[PDB]
Ligand binder design. Sequence first.
Ligand SMILES: [Ca+2]
Length: 639
Amino acid sequence: ASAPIGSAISRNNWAVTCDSAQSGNECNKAIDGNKDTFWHTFYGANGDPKPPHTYTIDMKTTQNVNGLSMLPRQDGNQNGWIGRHEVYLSSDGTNWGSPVASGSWFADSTTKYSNFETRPARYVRLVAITEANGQPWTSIAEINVFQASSYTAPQPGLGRWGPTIDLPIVPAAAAIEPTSGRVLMWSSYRNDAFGGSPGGITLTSSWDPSTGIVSDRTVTVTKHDMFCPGISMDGNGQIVVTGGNDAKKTSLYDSSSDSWIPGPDMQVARGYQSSATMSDGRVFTIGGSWSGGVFEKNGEVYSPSSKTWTSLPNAKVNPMLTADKQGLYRSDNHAWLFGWKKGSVFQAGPSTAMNWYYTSGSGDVKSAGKRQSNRGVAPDAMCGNAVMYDAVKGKILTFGGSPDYQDSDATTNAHIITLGEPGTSPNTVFASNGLYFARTFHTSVVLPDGSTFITGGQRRGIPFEDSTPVFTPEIYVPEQDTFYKQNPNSIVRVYHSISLLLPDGRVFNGGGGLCGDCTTNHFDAQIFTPNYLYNSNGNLATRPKITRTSTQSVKVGGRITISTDSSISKASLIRYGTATHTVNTDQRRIPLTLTNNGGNSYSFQVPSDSGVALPGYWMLFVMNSAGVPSVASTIRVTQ
Ligand SMILES: [Ca+2]
């Protein structure tokens, strides 16, 4: 199931308007309170005009609208299920602006929702752009519009949430497809559940930021239900998805061809493990006792060149185990892994003990000391997040999480870990005064300016329950060692939520739930627009533009020359992300040192160390004096 975020507006005074309506199926049948009567557009007798079909509501009075719901016809007939759609709001009925929600609803008879940030409106319009099975018609049994108990204008300077992207699935895992700019998402064998899977299948969905189209694809070629996997972008530009519901499987997603290829089985059955791309483009993984048994699950390594997983039994998982009450089932999950120099992987937590993992020979592990500060030893932080916001300087910001996976109070603990050479114990200090809000199951991304955006989570980890939710996201600004609250959102994003940085410099935050009949499934995402995209008026800032790039593919240590339409003060490369279960081992940021060639021509060198400049796809952002980022130019970094 799912749920509206607001409460149903009284429909007694509503006037409704439909592009067409069969007699017996009038526009007002969608607002009569009867699940057995439905509006239906013209068919047969009147011909079959194709979509778009439009449902427009005059609520007569201004309401603080934060959603709609759409109950499909309930007669066992599929005709007119709304697929692609947009929701518009209006104060006058004439000027509709941009959609507050858009995307695609799953093809079934269940109630669908559009949950979105509160916006005072008197008119609400639902456009059915397509029918879920490609037929001419639109039918709605019941349409409802929801209100918050109040409206507060967003605070100026603190970013903006919206629009909502409606989805056919709960995007519990997601990646950017860097060659297309699209957002790839997946659930499990079902759009809303992982429990009861027979294995062998994954439902996926994509969102295209340019076209606004949400599509879907069922993946069976890899014989893999990819719920709760490791995810890494390898040096061959392929997303390596490991284990999970099918605990030994590897699936490979190729962005170029937009296709999935079977990968080799891992040596060890795993779920809830983290995997990390290494300096040589290979992928390391360790832990994961969520599936395939509970026992010591030591490291192993994937080569995209030989297409093999090789066990690294001496890369011991024991040192990175938390003291989780549930034991090994949880204690080896969601390692905060980062590919580093010379085939090493740093494990920053969640366990108090941090560790270096080595991938030469049959593997090794070396204690890197305890995550700590003058405030004390950091406790275990399961589902805390870790973000490498300056790879050049080895800077990792870690935050939140709880000592146990579940039934455990989250904390505001946050640290800055500074990586030096593998085998040395990094410096660790407390980050500012910690998070504003204790949270676990939150998600986070590094932004073009090096700040880290932190969103969602709850104070008390209760998977599948939307309790103690944190609605106010925070941004850590490293230069100021300060966290800033941003404008809050209205949709709970807890267990099974994701966040990714978009090429346009916005954040895509979605998912949560995946519990079948539970009401806490969120079949959506929302866009957060950072303040850096807004000028002092609160309008969208003029963005500097990259008018030419010397190349789209560079070796580590290589130079790229660009031209811009205006002078730029700062530049960054941000490695494209992947996300599930709080884990994102793919994103990282490199601050670029720019050579001003004059004439708005600039050059920079990609770091020569591939442990820093992890091979794969990266976003180049350039920022003007005003600190407004360009949209990203995609750069492939190779060895
Ligand atoms: Ca009805």
